[PDB]
Write an enzyme that holds these catalytic residues in place. Structure first.
Site, PDB file in Angstrom:
ATOM      1  N   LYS A  65       1.029  -1.187   0.012  1.00 53.47           N
ATOM      2  CA  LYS A  65      -0.017   0.084  -0.092  1.00 53.47           C
ATOM      3  C   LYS A  65       0.798   1.251   0.112  1.00 53.47           C
ATOM      4  CE  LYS A  65      -2.305   1.783   3.390  1.00 53.47           C
ATOM      5  NZ  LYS A  65      -3.220   1.960   4.485  1.00 53.47           N
ATOM      6  N   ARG A 108     -10.636  -0.789   7.590  1.00 52.89           N
ATOM      7  CA  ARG A 108      -9.969  -1.669   8.703  1.00 52.89           C
ATOM      8  C   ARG A 108      -9.508  -1.137   9.754  1.00 52.89           C
ATOM      9  NH1 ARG A 108      -5.033   1.095   8.793  1.00 52.89           N
ATOM     10  NH2 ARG A 108      -3.447   0.642   7.597  1.00 52.89           N
ATOM     11  N   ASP A 157     -16.469  17.185  19.639  1.00 52.18           N
ATOM     12  CA  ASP A 157     -15.500  17.593  18.494  1.00 52.18           C
ATOM     13  C   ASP A 157     -15.489  19.013  18.686  1.00 52.18           C
ATOM     14  OD1 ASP A 157     -15.008  16.284  15.219  1.00 52.18           O
ATOM     15  OD2 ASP A 157     -14.683  18.250  15.800  1.00 52.18           O
ATOM     16  N   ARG A 159     -15.345  21.001  16.812  1.00 54.66           N
ATOM     17  CA  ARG A 159     -16.308  21.546  15.620  1.00 54.66           C
ATOM     18  C   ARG A 159     -17.564  20.969  15.892  1.00 54.66           C
ATOM     19  NH1 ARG A 159     -11.594  20.901  12.479  1.00 54.66           N
ATOM     20  NH2 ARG A 159     -11.501  22.458  11.025  1.00 54.66           N
ATOM     21  N   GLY A 217      -6.313   8.347  17.004  1.00 53.82           N
ATOM     22  CA  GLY A 217      -5.749   9.415  16.288  1.00 53.82           C
ATOM     23  C   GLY A 217      -4.303   9.719  16.008  1.00 53.82           C
ATOM     24  N   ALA A 218      -3.549   9.236  17.063  1.00 61.31           N
ATOM     25  CA  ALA A 218      -2.237   9.400  17.116  1.00 61.31           C
ATOM     26  C   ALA A 218      -1.517   8.158  16.157  1.00 61.31           C
ATOM     27  CB  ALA A 218      -1.597   9.292  18.355  1.00 61.31           C
ATOM     28  N   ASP A 219      -0.775   8.828  14.875  1.00 61.46           N
ATOM     29  CA  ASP A 219      -0.071   7.690  13.852  1.00 61.46           C
ATOM     30  C   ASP A 219       1.252   8.273  13.460  1.00 61.46           C
ATOM     31  OD1 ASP A 219      -0.219   9.258  11.468  1.00 61.46           O
ATOM     32  OD2 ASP A 219      -2.311   8.982  12.062  1.00 61.46           O
ATOM     33  N   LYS A 223       2.450  13.138  17.509  1.00 58.99           N
ATOM     34  CA  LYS A 223       0.909  13.035  17.819  1.00 58.99           C
ATOM     35  C   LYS A 223       0.933  12.420  19.253  1.00 58.99           C
ATOM     36  CE  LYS A 223      -1.153  12.508  13.212  1.00 58.99           C
ATOM     37  NZ  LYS A 223      -1.994  11.730  12.247  1.00 58.99           N
ATOM     38  N   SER A 290      -3.589   2.057  18.297  1.00 61.78           N
ATOM     39  CA  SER A 290      -3.546   1.719  16.989  1.00 61.78           C
ATOM     40  C   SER A 290      -2.883   2.669  15.935  1.00 61.78           C
ATOM     41  CB  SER A 290      -5.224   1.646  16.706  1.00 61.78           C
ATOM     42  OG  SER A 290      -5.463   1.464  15.306  1.00 61.78           O
TER      43      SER A 290
HETATM   44  N1  LIG Z   1      -4.200   4.380  13.292  1.00 67.71           N
HETATM   45  C1  LIG Z   1      -4.539   3.978  11.934  1.00 67.71           C
HETATM   46  O1  LIG Z   1      -4.430   3.009  11.334  1.00 67.71           O
HETATM   47  C2  LIG Z   1      -5.437   5.262  11.218  1.00 67.71           C
HETATM   48  C3  LIG Z   1      -6.466   5.173  10.140  1.00 67.71           C
HETATM   49  C4  LIG Z   1      -6.889   6.251   9.656  1.00 67.71           C
HETATM   50  C5  LIG Z   1      -6.675   7.740  10.209  1.00 67.71           C
HETATM   51  N2  LIG Z   1      -5.827   7.775  11.273  1.00 67.71           N
HETATM   52  C6  LIG Z   1      -5.688   8.943  11.903  1.00 67.71           C
HETATM   53  O2  LIG Z   1      -6.817   9.343  12.389  1.00 67.71           O
HETATM   54  C7  LIG Z   1      -7.055  11.050  12.183  1.00 67.71           C
HETATM   55  C8  LIG Z   1      -8.046  11.375  11.422  1.00 67.71           C
HETATM   56  O3  LIG Z   1      -9.567  10.704  11.517  1.00 67.71           O
HETATM   57  P1  LIG Z   1     -10.329  10.959  10.132  1.00 67.71           P
HETATM   58  O4  LIG Z   1      -9.958  10.283   9.172  1.00 67.71           O
HETATM   59  O5  LIG Z   1     -11.969  10.853  10.594  1.00 67.71           O
HETATM   60  O6  LIG Z   1     -10.027  12.547  10.115  1.00 67.71           O
HETATM   61  P2  LIG Z   1     -10.955  13.983  10.150  1.00 67.71           P
HETATM   62  O7  LIG Z   1     -10.134  15.281   9.990  1.00 67.71           O
HETATM   63  O8  LIG Z   1     -12.343  13.862   9.263  1.00 67.71           O
HETATM   64  O9  LIG Z   1     -11.392  13.586  11.800  1.00 67.71           O
HETATM   65  C9  LIG Z   1     -10.945  14.129  12.949  1.00 67.71           C
HETATM   66  C10 LIG Z   1     -11.866  15.024  13.523  1.00 67.71           C
HETATM   67  O10 LIG Z   1     -11.202  15.389  14.920  1.00 67.71           O
HETATM   68  C11 LIG Z   1     -11.797  16.726  15.379  1.00 67.71           C
HETATM   69  N3  LIG Z   1     -10.795  17.220  16.227  1.00 67.71           N
HETATM   70  C12 LIG Z   1      -9.551  17.927  15.703  1.00 67.71           C
HETATM   71  N4  LIG Z   1      -8.861  18.397  16.876  1.00 67.71           N
HETATM   72  C13 LIG Z   1      -9.713  18.012  17.893  1.00 67.71           C
HETATM   73  C14 LIG Z   1      -9.370  18.494  19.442  1.00 67.71           C
HETATM   74  N5  LIG Z   1      -8.381  18.999  19.813  1.00 67.71           N
HETATM   75  N6  LIG Z   1     -10.577  17.905  20.216  1.00 67.71           N
HETATM   76  C15 LIG Z   1     -11.615  17.128  19.543  1.00 67.71           C
HETATM   77  N7  LIG Z   1     -11.956  16.936  18.377  1.00 67.71           N
HETATM   78  C16 LIG Z   1     -10.822  17.432  17.432  1.00 67.71           C
HETATM   79  C17 LIG Z   1     -12.016  17.267  13.868  1.00 67.71           C
HETATM   80  O11 LIG Z   1     -12.844  18.628  14.003  1.00 67.71           O
HETATM   81  C18 LIG Z   1     -12.511  16.313  13.178  1.00 67.71           C
HETATM   82  O12 LIG Z   1     -13.894  16.124  12.716  1.00 67.71           O
HETATM   83  C19 LIG Z   1      -5.620  11.389  12.237  1.00 67.71           C
HETATM   84  O13 LIG Z   1      -4.871  11.665  13.070  1.00 67.71           O
HETATM   85  C20 LIG Z   1      -5.074  10.300  11.177  1.00 67.71           C
HETATM   86  O14 LIG Z   1      -3.661  10.533  10.775  1.00 67.71           O
HETATM   87  C21 LIG Z   1      -5.198   6.532  11.783  1.00 67.71           C
HETATM   88 NA    NA Z   2      -4.334   8.615  19.808  1.00 63.66          NA
END
Ligand SMILES: NC(=O)c1ccc[n+]([C@@H]2O[C@H](COP(=O)([O-])OP(=O)(O)OC[C@H]3O[C@@H](n4cnc5c(N)ncnc54)[C@H](O)[C@@H]3O)[C@@H](O)[C@H]2O)c1
Ligand code: NA
Ligand SMILES: NC(=O)c1ccc[n+]([C@@H]2O[C@H](COP(=O)([O-])OP(=O)(O)OC[C@H]3O[C@@H](n4cnc5c(N)ncnc54)[C@H](O)[C@@H]3O)[C@@H](O)[C@H]2O)c1
Ligand code: NA
Lengths: 320, 320
Positions: A65, A108, A157, A159, A217-219, A223, A290
């Site tokens: 990927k 996934r 959120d 937002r 979230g952290a990746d 982060k 994760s």
């Molecule tokens: N671990 C994995 O395999 C994996 C898979 C997909 C995405 N990710 C990670 O997931 C995150 C993105 O998730 P997504 O694809 O839904 O993105 P996105 O931007 O659609 O979702 C993130 C949400 O977080 C909210 N947000 C931002 N800062 C915030 C805070 N301080 N407090 C509360 N809410 C907050 C935003 O307004 C948004 O709605 C990133 O960190 C990304 O790199 C990791």
């Molecule tokens: Na995290």
């Protein structure tokens, strides 16, 4: 020879969250038993973002990927994350398919969240809290309801528009839910953090005993979504030890020396495989860190490919 | 938006050997000056072959070539080597094109051989000998033709019809070429070694002074093509130091401890950028140890991509 080409729209109609969940669970099981091969992710850093190569071999397939992450993309007219998977045959090396992996990457990750809570959260969990209500939160929600009857959803959120939408999405499918400040959303049995924050978004004093946290979230380096004091007090179960160290919820803590490797209890595969215990008491706070593993993308791509042959979906190109 | 798709037949019509040699020469220079990024190769080993990920960033493009090697493929109805390159914008991360890299991989290796000799062989070179006559021999030959003016060509191989499949192909376009076993082929101005052997196939003795050697075959931890002694006595110029001491011509002698860092004269990019000198004596022996760099594959993909846009070639897929 023909290589199958699969679009995001096509791939979306080729896997079930349940299929994704079964595949991700077996992938973890196989990797922990050494029956899967997976090199570390490779990064190509750019000034405006990056690209990552994630190769893996298991379940009879091999693939790579190639995903990118460019924040300024939406402020431009494109998704932040786009991914392509090349699926190959391990016996001939032939590129069986080139598919969109954008959707299946979210799918996934959702599936893993659901499988980790199944093994780590109290069997009686009913209150689900979400810190972050973007894309991934929806996938986590969907995977989790395959394993728990969700009594209540508390959504936060920064937002408000996004939290209300997620809340409305829940109600639509009969799940009781409400928008809530961060401190209250954190009070639950299963807490799903899905933000890209680089500073703590959840305070330790907000987390009650028995909580299972899907820290998603952290990746990437730096982060971090959790008060480090939560880490000290919890049974941490990671994705992949080395990827968590580098960019998972525990990266900052490990880097600044707060917690060590003895502080990591097991990988999720070890728990699924019976090599390490999962949750052992009702009081403990569990955490699933994760990061996203190539074995999950290949496992899942295998399902999309076979379902694609079955339904005559796709288009074909003779590359060589 | 869309991703351009290019077949091997199309790519073949989109890049000339001269373009490849200029792209590759510039790729080596740029990287020696730190204007390019290239992390190590990533392998996936299978019972009957492997697959490697080769990503690079330079010249305003990023890309990942995903390529296999399954020796038992021909006797199965497939080429041993097939490859795909996903080319991307470093700005948005968007995958601009997914194209065949089977043909270019060969092209960019011949090109390299051609550039290495241009900087390392006697400016008077005219007698060339080949130890292999397989696919790669043809590309080294075709590239050397753009650099020096040939007269005769000495060709050998552990098969005879191939020396023939080669000699007449060689004769057909205008250079006197005869089959002549190891010992005989081995003396020339330029010796081009293109075999997958595991022990010397060229003896120190056999080689006259003033000879420049293209050591193209040594591709992994196991093989070597030259008698270690030839090494102790030559201007040794590498591809990438890390990759050669790992699987190039110098990996054995280095692993056995006979030669080390101090013994390698330079990186070919270093000679080109003039950070290290090349031939400095009509007598000295010079060797170009080639392992194959991702930066060569991306540099060549950029040319294919731009020519494709310019001539309106290729099909398109909307992956997202
Ligand atoms: N671990 C994995 O395999 C994996 C898979 C997909 C995405 N990710 C990670 O997931 C995150 C993105 O998730 P997504 O694809 O839904 O993105 P996105 O931007 O659609 O979702 C993130 C949400 O977080 C909210 N947000 C931002 N800062 C915030 C805070 N301080 N407090 C509360 N809410 C907050 C935003 O307004 C948004 O709605 C990133 O960190 C990304 O790199 C990791
Ligand atoms: Na995290
Ligand atoms: N370093 C690089 O940049 C690069 C690039 C491409 C391929 N390679 C290497 O090129 C080599 C072969 O090229 P290809 O895949 O086009 O090959 P091929 O199989 O089409 O040709 C190799 C030829 O070598 C001959 N040969 C085998 N063993 C020999 C021996 N011991 N002595 C004399 N001749 C012998 C064979 O009969 C054959 O014709 C392999 O070692 C491969 O890994 C290196
Ligand atoms: Na060699």
């Amino acid at each position: 020879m023909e290589t199958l080409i699969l679009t995001q729209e096509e791939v979306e109609s080729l896997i079930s969250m349940d299929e994704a969940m079964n595949a991700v669970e077996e992938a973890f099981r196989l990797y922990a038993l050494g029956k899967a091969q997976m090199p570390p992710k490779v990064y190509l850093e750019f000034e405006k973002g990056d690209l990552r190569a994630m190769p893996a071999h298991l379940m009879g397939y091999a693939g790579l990927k190639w995903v990118n992450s460019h924040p300024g993309n939406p402020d431009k007219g494109l998704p932040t994350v786009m991914a392509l998977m090349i699926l190959n045959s391990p016996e001939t090396g032939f590129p069986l398919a080139v598919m969109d992996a954008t959707y299946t990457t979210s799918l996934r990750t959702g599936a893993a969240g659901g499988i980790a809570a199944k093994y780590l959260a109290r069997k009686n969990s009913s209150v689900f809290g979400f810190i972050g209500c973007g894309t991934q939160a929806y996938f986590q929600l969907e995977a989790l309801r395959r394993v728990f009857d969700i009594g209540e959803v508390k959504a936060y959120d920064v937002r408000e528009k996004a939290a209300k939408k997620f809340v409305s999405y829940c109600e639509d499918r009969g799940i009781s839910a409400s928008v809530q400040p961060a401190e209250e959303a954190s009070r639950c049995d299963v807490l799903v953090t899905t933000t890209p924050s680089r500073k703590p978004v959840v305070k330790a004093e907000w987390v009650e005993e028995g909580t299972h946290i899907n820290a998603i979230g952290a990746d990437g380096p730096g982060k971090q979504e959790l008060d480090v004091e939560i880490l000290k007090k919890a049974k941490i179960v990671v994705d992949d030890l080395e990827q968590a160290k580098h960019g998972g919820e525990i990266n900052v803590a490990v880097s600044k020396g707060v917690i060590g490797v003895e502080d990591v209890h097991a990988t999720i595969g070890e728990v699924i495989a019976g090599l390490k215990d999962g949750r052992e008491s009702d009081e403990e706070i569990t955490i699933f860190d994760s990061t996203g593993l190539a074995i999950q993308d290949v496992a899942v791509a295998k399902v999309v490919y076979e379902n694609a042959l079955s339904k005559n979906v796709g288009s074909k190109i003779k590359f060589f």
